Amino acid sequence: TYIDPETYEDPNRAVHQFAKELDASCIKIERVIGAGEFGEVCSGRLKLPRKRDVAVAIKTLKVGYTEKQRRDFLCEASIMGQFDHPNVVHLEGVVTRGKPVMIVIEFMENGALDAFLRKHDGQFTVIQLVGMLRGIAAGMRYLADMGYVHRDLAARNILVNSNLVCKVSDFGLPVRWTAPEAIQYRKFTSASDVWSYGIVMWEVMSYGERPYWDMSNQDVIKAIEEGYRLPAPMDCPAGLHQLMLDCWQKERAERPKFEQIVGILDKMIRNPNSAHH
């Protein structure tokens, strides 16, 4: 059920096809909470026909844009808007023509996962962490069987809410996240995403540590070709590191599938101590 919008003769028919246009009147900007690649990402609320008010985040497109940057920008909203699943950020709608140009997404109060973990270092138990990864897996099983390949899967592109529910984000357009076949031959697949997931798995348990630390990309690739793989972060159960290695199998077939993953991680939250097998 996933159509690409860059398979479109108009890119701004995809936008309106999958995204609900919103009235700016109904949108409140309150704070800044980052700079997106296109325009200040702000936090705020949106007013629906009587539902208290939704807490939303607001990607802006700054003015004096190329009619292109607008297309690029909104090709995020055209994609994100086609997915409905708990562990994939909910689109609320867009502001295309008429008013300041905006993608109104659901508010994740905790921000990107890499940052949220670096700040809460050691504060989370191994069930809770397995639970956070469990969500992203759920996220990607959905996207996967929707026919979508993320390409840029990383802990900075997962977002966390008040309830520590992680959801997949960044739907637009990163060597140490990318699989060998994808780096070398652009063979981006839901297998290459599982590799990236593996790296996310390490990022989580490490609590937001940079993959491969300060190894150059050059070093990281040679490292991987020699068969180097990352080790069990402090306190990470061995079986859980093992899953990381499966995700990092060189033969992309041999990796587990996102459904297989969700499966394994569930056992571990079910019987934790088995996570050392």
UniProtKB/Swiss-Prot annotation:
- Tell me the tissue specificity: Widely expressed.
**Taxonomically, which superkingdom?**
Eukaryota
Q: Where is the Protein kinase domain?
A: 27-269
Phosphotyrosine is found on 2, 8
**Where does it live in the cell?**
Cell membrane
Q: Which residues bind ATP?
A: 33-41, 59
Q: According to the UniProt topology, which residue ranges lie Cytoplasmic?
A: 1-274
Disulfide bonds, paired cysteine numbers: none
Please describe the post-translational modifications of this protein: Phosphorylated.
Q: Where is the active site?
A: 152 (proton acceptor)
Subunit and interaction comment: Heterotetramer upon binding of the ligand. The heterotetramer is composed of an ephrin dimer and a receptor dimer. Oligomerization is probably required to induce biological responses. Interacts (via PDZ-binding motif) with GRIP1 and PICK1 (via PDZ domain).
Would you identify the family this protein belongs to, as annotated? Belongs to the protein kinase superfamily. Tyr protein kinase family. Ephrin receptor subfamily.
Function, as annotated: Receptor tyrosine kinase which binds promiscuously GPI-anchored ephrin-A family ligands residing on adjacent cells, leading to contact-dependent bidirectional signaling into neighboring cells. The signaling pathway downstream of the receptor is referred to as forward signaling while the signaling pathway downstream of the ephrin ligand is referred to as reverse signaling. Among GPI-anchored ephrin-A ligands, EFNA5 is a cognate/functional ligand for EPHA7 and their interaction regulates brain development modulating cell-cell adhesion and repulsion.
Q: What is this protein called?
A: Ephrin type-A receptor 7
- Source organism per entry reads Homo sapiens (Human)
